[PDB]
Ligand binder design. Structure first.
Ligand SMILES: O=C(O)c1cc(C(=O)O)c2c(n1)C(=O)C(=O)c1cc(C(=O)O)[nH]c1-2
Ligand SMILES: O=C(O)c1cc(C(=O)O)c2c(n1)C(=O)C(=O)c1cc(C(=O)O)[nH]c1-2
Ligand SMILES: [Ca+2]
Ligand SMILES: [Ca+2]
Lengths: 72, 596, 595, 72
């Protein structure tokens, strides 16, 4: 692997000598939990919803409130 | 922003990170010059009340200085005729658990300014370690709006400075050492409403590509590669956070910046080129859409995070033609120069001849030619790799002199040993997976653990270095240059220094209270020129001193490399301000006293 | 010590707290003077790595500077030709619980030095907040010996500087706000062995009195009063700790110092004169035996702790006879001058005309004449008492010019309201028993909370003030004077200042990073004169800022009085060094670089 | 009580109007626990005995040891 063999535009990766093309099923398989992989995108969706409630209350009332529990 | 351009033309002001939208850190002032710099001495000082590292530099606008700190991220406003009186202060309340998910000390790179329009007053913009972004009234310090950008419960924090363009503020991201997938965001500066958000990995809809992305250089790659250069869903925790600096050209409407390292550090766990981590981007300021993207380090094996400074210029190329350019010194040991209108490669040269990870960069294919003897992999201990993970360049903001056509660069001389290990991903826990040993490179003193830095003067078209000088420790905080034939910079052992711009000769230094990790700035006030710098050592080089660590593999391997730093400096936090013969606001000492 | 006397005669050294055994803080140097002080500017700086208050001043001996810090009490040694290299450091390990029984911030007042004898090497002597005392090798920093003086489990800590006399080191005491009975101790400087220990209350055997104690002034009191001026066993928890400063005269062999307040602050819980709290002592350096003792404040009602600076001089009295003297400005609003050979009272005058707690001091009987309208007691709220418990003078070390016969004093201008309350004693817990409100005195601005300090020049025989000047905040850290016609001092709002010795006119100031609560010092190195001062605000005036407090009755009442201090300064820790034109060790910038 | 009426040299205290000459048995009695009063003198005796073990071992051996469990 010297970086100069490219099967397509922007795609030049090769395995090193003795290593596999795909790691699934090998002794290098990471076995990630899908429920852990999805936690940071669900957290961003919830921040975005709390921010929309803050910004729409500012533009109706003219007074900013950060604490969502105190917004009508 | 048209009024920020106009304000940057006055020598009484310093209005944004990097001085101006070209990001050159260059002043036309010459009251202080090579003929009289021996007379420079302190005029006044100010302590921030905090320890840990003090990064970035102050802002100056309309007769006032604005100062920022380490965690918990306080802000102070001072009047230049009487800096003993504090005009206002903002002191945030934050969850102490934010400290436990910071990789690299409790640092912050600084403030931005929006000049107001016709009913909204002028604003100071700031980030906080806990992931909030706030706008403050510049005259009173009161909060106008505050929103949540990043979540500490999944390992996501903020250390970058905000950047103002037109009537928007741009916000980056931190946490690749904890498996955070990078994104940058534009907000409405008047209200906090989200306008656009672009990710560094994943499906094209999330990347925000223009319909003509990379049309001039299609061999760089085009559609489908944010999932096509990964196995399965590994892109979901894949890194690419952007925590460095920006530049802007009103004539192209593009912002210029780099994305960080893929996660984890164990390369064997993520086969593929891992796009679009490690990439130089040009994105539209109003929609976020990418016009071009160049990947500097395909399939990273070394933590060469691609976030460093962007400096703009206009110069004739080797065939005599005038070009509009960007110049960018990377962690990986290469300094890159590109055409900033379409992304074309102009030059890619080594920062020092001891770089061994690549043999060269091919200008016609765009790929770096790898030396397999200096790569990393499972079940192998790799030795004597240059550069180390700390880089031959890190977060320092450098400078450019447009009369001389030279870049002045603060450089690191640090090499390494590395072995990876297998580990699970758990949201909120570290996700690194490698053990390191770090030490001085071949031109320093490896047996004594000294000789870890350099400062150099560089031409980007010919590739020639006009002069080169060795330093005791890495030059970590950047540089500032002036029309007085001077280059200024701070050091980790605790000095402000000045060198001759044409030869590199050491003309002057002063012993400040603690090591410096930010850049110098300069301004005039009622006819007198001043030079200011923060003191307070920290960031990655300072972790052994700051956290009382002694295992040399601790601190991601920085503790062994900087074992002698505590013999030369201790922690601190504040600003020192200099002038010729120390002239200042208290030359009549009755100014500012209590009277009955 | 005869070798310390000789080393103090060189202008290249500063070898003890207070410069010399007279404790005058006075330099014969005149390179820096009233004609050129506008040229004074910084030469070099050093951060200590710590926040909280930085009290005392550095030592200079044999081409080296020795620096000390707030808790956990670190020590640094620097070479004057290259101060960017740290020669050695000492970093103690201490129980974090020591912080919870400190009354008044995590401060320390400094180091002492003993010059060696050919067998034992020269030594640096230090105290720690947790109650240990240590001797360090001056060349290498390694520990030679370490012993336990004070116990945090009963409320007892250390903040005082050690003091070296002959081949002995003298160590004081802290904790009267927690009911600690005061004592001072002498140790053999070579080994740590305890030689003598003297208590402030209790039976005569524990007081360590000479057989002829007060024979020249028997009306001051003599035998049996350490228990006879208390009811039952209340003397066992009775206060009298000594945490301020000393002076010494080789010709009398006496050390001079004051004992602090009785416990609790609630006066109704301890009827009697409460001897020997609030007392000026003269004790033999080798045996500890007291020659004389004068009680300034019988039955304290105000927390006027009697620990302040001692300054020696030799002057003609009003009848024209030459006298050997001590002069001492107290918390209670009175400045005292005594004969230092026999204890006789010479003068006792007000620090400012606004003092109202006493009408006068009777020089023939020695008793202060009390005004009962300004006393304290149970079931009563007392208002507008001057001075407050913070004093018209606190822990700052002042100076004396021997040719002008003038004392230069840093003063406080603070008054109060006070009411006591009943409470039990439990060892290890606070034992105060009063609630306070504090504010500026009548010559300041009581509604903006500014005008809380003064600096004055004084003659001890005539009682005349040559000049007087107001300050924004209390002048807390002391003064230093020179033969260049200048008086130097630091301020809580963050300056080093210089005034003219004859008129008080302000000639110069510099904005340092944080407020100053220690004294300035001066020395020569290879022909150049330097002036140095610590920065880092704290102590009693800084508790609001240091601990993030807002209730005005908190910090024993100090939070309300100093509510505007945070508008002028923030915390810090370090040293700034000045010279004419900023000349220093890096004038060749290649010195100290890597090669 | 103005401080000028003395029944012996150095003993001039008097009670204020309405207050007692002695507080035991009165509404101001502190009622102190004798065992709490004696704690700081017991602590000083234990410090003085540990310091004597440290000092005598330094003079005999020429090497300083602070941990008294390591001194035979
Ligand atoms: O990957 C990331 O998100 C991330 C964030 C930070 C940061 O936010 O300060 C640093 C790092 N990486 C890192 O690779 C690095 O070398 C580094 C040095 C420092 C500094 O302030 O000295 N920060 C960071
Ligand atoms: O009663 C005592 O034992 C004791 C100790 C201390 C100290 O150790 O600093 C102070 C006080 N009292 C006190 O009364 C006081 O006003 C005070 C001010 C300060 C200071 O450093 O600013 N320490 C102390
Ligand atoms: Ca990183
Ligand atoms: Ca006290």
């Amino acid at each position: 692997y010297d970086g100069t063999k490219c099967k397509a535009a922007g795609n030049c990766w090769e395995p090193k000598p003795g290593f596999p093309e795909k790691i699934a099923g090998s002794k290098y398989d990471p076995k990630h939990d899908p429920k852990e992989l999805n936690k940071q995108a669900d957290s961003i969706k919830q921040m975005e919803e709390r921010n929309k409630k803050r910004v729409e209350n500012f533009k109706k009332t003219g007074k900013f409130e950060y604490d969502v529990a105190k917004i009508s | 922003n048209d009024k920020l351009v106009e304000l940057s033309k006055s020598d009484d002001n310093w209005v944004m990170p990097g001085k101006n939208y070209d990001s050159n850190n260059f002043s036309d002032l010459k009251q202080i010059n090579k003929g009289n710099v021996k007379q420079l001495r302190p005029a006044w000082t100010f302590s921030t009340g905090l320890l840990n590292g003090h990064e970035g530099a102050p802002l100056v606008v309309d007769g006032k200085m604005y100062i920022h700190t380490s965690f918990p991220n306080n802000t102070f406003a001072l009047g230049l005729d009487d800096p003993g009186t504090i005009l206002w202060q903002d002191k945030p309340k934050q969850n102490p658990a934010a400290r436990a998910v910071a990789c690299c000390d409790l640092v912050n790179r600084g403030l931005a300014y929006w000049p107001g329009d016709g009913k909204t007053p002028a604003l100071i913009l700031k980030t906080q370690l806990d992931g909030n972004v706030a706008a403050l009234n510049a005259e009173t310090g009161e909060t106008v709006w505050k929103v949540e950008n990043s979540d500490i419960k999944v390992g996501s924090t903020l250390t970058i400075a905000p950047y103002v363009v037109k009537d928007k503020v741009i916000i980056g991201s931190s946490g690749a050492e904890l498996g955070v997938r990078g994104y940058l965001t534009a907000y409405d500066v008047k209200t906090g409403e989200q306008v656009w958000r672009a990710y560094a990995t994943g499906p094209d809809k999330d990347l925000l590509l223009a319909s003509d992305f990379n049309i001039k250089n299609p061999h760089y790659g085009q559609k489908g590669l944010g999932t096509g250069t990964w196995e399965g869903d590994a892109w979901k925790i894949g890194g690419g956070t952007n925590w460095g600096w920006y530049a802007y050209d009103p004539g192209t409407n593009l912002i210029y910046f780099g994305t960080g390292n893929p996660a984890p550090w164990n390369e064997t766990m993520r086969p593929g080129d891992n796009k679009w981590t490690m990439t130089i981007f040009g994105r539209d300021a109003d929609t976020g859409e990418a016009k071009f993207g160049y990947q500097k380090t395909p399939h990273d094996e070394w933590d060469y995070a691609g976030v460093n400074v962007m400096m703009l210029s206009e110069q004739k190329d080797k065939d005599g033609k005038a070009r509009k350019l960007l110049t960018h010194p990377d962690r990986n040991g290469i300094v890159y120069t590109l055409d900033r209108t379409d992304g074309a490669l102009v030059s890619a040269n080594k920062l020092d001849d001891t770089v061994n990870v690549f043999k060269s960069v091919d200008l016609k294919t765009g790929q770096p030619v790898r030396d397999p003897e200096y790569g990393t992999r499972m079940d192998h201990l790799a030795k004597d790799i240059c550069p180390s993970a700390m880089g031959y360049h890190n977060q320092g903001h450098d400078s450019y002199d447009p009369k001389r056509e030279l870049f002045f660069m603060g450089i690191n001389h640090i090499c390494m040993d590395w072995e990876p290990f297998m580990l699970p991903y758990k949201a909120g826990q570290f996700f690194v997976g490698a053990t390191l040993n770090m030490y001085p490179g071949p031109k320093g003193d490896r047996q004594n653990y000294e000789g870890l830095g350099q400062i150099k003067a560089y031409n980007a078209i010919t590739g020639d270095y006009k002069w080169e000088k060795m330093e005791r420790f890495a030059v970590w905080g950047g540089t500032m240059a002036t029309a007085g034939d001077l280059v200024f910079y701070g050091t980790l052992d605790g000095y402000l220094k000045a060198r001759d711009s044409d030869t590199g000769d050491l003309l002057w230094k002063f012993k400040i209270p603690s090591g410096a990790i930010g850049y110098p700035m300069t301004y005039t006030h009622k006819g007198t020129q001043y030079v200011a710098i923060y003191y307070g050592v920290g960031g990655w080089p300072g972790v052994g001193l700051v956290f009382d660590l002694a295992d040399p593999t601790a601190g991601l391997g920085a503790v062994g490399a900087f074992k002698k730093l505590a013999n030369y400096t201790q922690m601190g936090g504040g600003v020192v301000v200099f002038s010729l013969d120390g002239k200042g606001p208290y030359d009549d000492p009755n100014v500012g006293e209590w009277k009955s």
